[PDB]
Enzyme design. Sequence first.
Site, PDB file in Angstrom:
ATOM      1  N   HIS A  86       0.786  -1.226   0.000  1.00  8.95           N
ATOM      2  CA  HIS A  86       0.000   0.000   0.000  1.00  8.95           C
ATOM      3  C   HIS A  86       0.816   1.273   0.000  1.00  8.95           C
ATOM      4  O   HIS A  86       0.294   2.317  -0.188  1.00  8.95           O
ATOM      5  CB  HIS A  86      -1.067   0.004   1.085  1.00  8.95           C
ATOM      6  N   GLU A 136     -13.566  12.941  12.157  1.00 10.36           N
ATOM      7  CA  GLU A 136     -12.771  13.327  10.991  1.00 10.36           C
ATOM      8  C   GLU A 136     -13.463  14.517  10.333  1.00 10.36           C
ATOM      9  O   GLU A 136     -14.416  15.062  10.881  1.00 10.36           O
ATOM     10  CB  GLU A 136     -12.607  12.155  10.002  1.00 10.36           C
ATOM     11  N   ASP A 166      -8.396   4.299   8.192  1.00 10.29           N
ATOM     12  CA  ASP A 166      -9.622   4.464   7.388  1.00 10.29           C
ATOM     13  C   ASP A 166      -9.921   3.232   6.539  1.00 10.29           C
ATOM     14  O   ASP A 166     -11.077   2.943   6.248  1.00 10.29           O
ATOM     15  CB  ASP A 166      -9.529   5.680   6.455  1.00 10.29           C
TER      16      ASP A 166
END
EC number: 1.5.99.12
Length: 496
Positions: A73, A250, A135
Amino acid sequence: PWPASLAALALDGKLRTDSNATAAASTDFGNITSALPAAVLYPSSTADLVALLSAANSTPGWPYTIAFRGRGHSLMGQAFAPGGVVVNMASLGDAPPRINVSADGRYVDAGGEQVWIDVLRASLARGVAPRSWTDYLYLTVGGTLSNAGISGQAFRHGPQISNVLEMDVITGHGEMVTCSKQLNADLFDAVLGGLGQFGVITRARIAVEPAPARARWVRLVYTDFAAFSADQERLTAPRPASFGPMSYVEGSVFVNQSLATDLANTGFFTDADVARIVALAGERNATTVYSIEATLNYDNATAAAAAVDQELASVLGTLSYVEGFAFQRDVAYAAFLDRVHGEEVALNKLGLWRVPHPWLNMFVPRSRIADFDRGVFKGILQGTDIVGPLIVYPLNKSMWDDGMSAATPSEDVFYAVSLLFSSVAPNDLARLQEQNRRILRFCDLAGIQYKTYAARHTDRSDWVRHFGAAKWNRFVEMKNKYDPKRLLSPGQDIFN
Ligand SMILES: *Cc1cc2c(cc1C)nc1c(=O)[nH]c(=O)nc-1n2C[C@H](O)[C@H](O)[C@H](O)COP(=O)(O)OP(=O)(O)OC[C@H]1O[C@@H](n2cnc3c(N)ncnc32)[C@H](O)[C@@H]1O
Ligand SMILES: *[C@@H]1O[C@H](CO)[C@@H](O[C@@H]2O[C@H](CO)[C@@H](O)[C@H](O)[C@H]2NC(C)=O)[C@H](O)[C@H]1NC(C)=O
Ligand SMILES: *[C@@H]1O[C@H](CO)[C@@H](O[C@@H]2O[C@H](CO)[C@@H](O)[C@H](O)[C@H]2NC(C)=O)[C@H](O)[C@H]1NC(C)=O
Ligand SMILES: O=C(Nc1ccccc1)Nc1ccnc(Cl)c1
Ligand SMILES: *[C@@H]1O[C@H](CO)[C@@H](O)[C@H](O)[C@H]1NC(C)=O
Ligand SMILES: *[C@@H]1O[C@H](CO)[C@@H](O)[C@H](O)[C@H]1NC(C)=O
């Protein structure tokens, strides 16, 4: 000359050089840079990792750098080993069990290679769940821990590195070492936010809490950045005790040029909500719209729905969002936690694993966030077409352990800023990369003391500035103690 344990891995077909293996380990999620390794290791147990790293340490002139690929990632090659050996960590998940919830339900042991989604599933089956998340759940335990692991829970629980009881780490010497705040505390601190520089995490002991069943999920709309930022800080401030009722906080920035499209693409707002917010923006003559995103976790109890309604109504009454612009959803807890991969399977609008992602993630001190908003959201980003979320939310420094490797701004409050641009055409990619330099140039000239996150620097003085000079010294100290040959995770470009 090869050690007998090393050659056995080649013999068992675990160490591979074929074009298929090397190609798959040569690209990452960023899809911007690529680097072919010489070989890929597919370990069946932790002993295979011991064997590789022992060979590396006890072989003079060993020329092969080693990276530990979680899910790749990484954005800019941090999981590559150019002309070296990439470890395909996921191969460890192919008996004995890789996720062990404690008997007493206080923690969960997970293999470094395990992805957080599986950790969640195994935890939920036993009625528990980790407290601090990212997330996106298809990242590895060891991958997020080598960075910090941030999401909307970190203001109250700290990042994921603040929720680890202990770890098993195979050091660059080839030595299996168990570490915590007690035993081998120096290695424990180094590896957390350590960017894979000192060893591979094979096991992490992760703090859990009783698993909530549902999340009341709210979005609040603002046209004024001052009100938006003040309310985020209100929701995340420590009490005169602990932190308020919110489980997750957030925020999002929406630029006027693509407002309707971007609001509709949140997967949160209905077309009715979108029309109202668009009208609001036109009324206020806003070039930017802001949305707080927050949750309240609760269980299946019969009273819980009413208790959450009262708690929320109470909370909302202290806030300054545009009157009537509170938008409310109610979902299962696992559904909320896995919302991002949820979209990836659903639509994948961001072309995850499909297109380039010149993402910019940084921590901005609270005192300069309004300047950042002006120079970037109301400045550089205006008049451009943006594909991808712009996420902004405050964090509390008190919940971060500055003894750990991860670097943060010095102020008590700092904001995670995540500009998650997806590139279409190739001229879009070069533009976005330039735009990122332009944003960092702006902050440099404005004297904003930011820290990047999940980014790699290519200049020594930049890394020194990143950690701070004194913290840099203890980073090098740990590099010399645990990876003297400087073979580990060369794609970070710190010692390579
Ligand atoms: C792709 C992406 C990433 C992401 C995200 C959403 C998407 C779509 N959302 C995040 C979030 O909300 N909060 C957060 O903190 N991070 C988020 N990320 C970024 C992610 O943390 C990084 O990409 C990170 O690198 C984890 O990803 P992954 O598990 O795939 O790890 P990697 O890229 O292959 O390797 C990163 C570096 O760490 C070293 N490494 C990997 N595993 C280990 C273990 N087990 N032990 C020691 N070191 C390890 C690698 O060598 C590499 O240098
Ligand atoms: C989860 O628990 C299993 C068994 O309870 C652990 O399996 C042991 O693994 C060690 C090291 O590989 C072996 O020496 C033992 O023989 C195994 N015992 C059993 C009963 O299988 C495993 O280590 C644990 N996994 C994690 C990630 O903590
Ligand atoms: C926000 O963006 C919209 C759409 O790009 C702007 O609306 C346009 O305004 C121009 C006038 O300069 C008109 O020629 C266009 O017909 C409008 N387009 C649409 C789709 O309505 C709006 O002016 C922008 N608002 C702000 C504050 O920048
Ligand atoms: O991707 C993120 N969030 C996200 C992504 C897609 C949809 C919604 C949120 N967040 C994030 C945070 C820190 N570092 C990185 Cl690389 C990424
Ligand atoms: C990016 O991905 C595309 C499509 O999967 C691929 O053709 C290309 O080689 C990749 N580029 C890099 C730099 O990884
Ligand atoms: C609306 O905002 C734009 C850009 O911020 C500004 O130039 C313009 O003067 C504003 N219009 C009015 C009527 O205030």
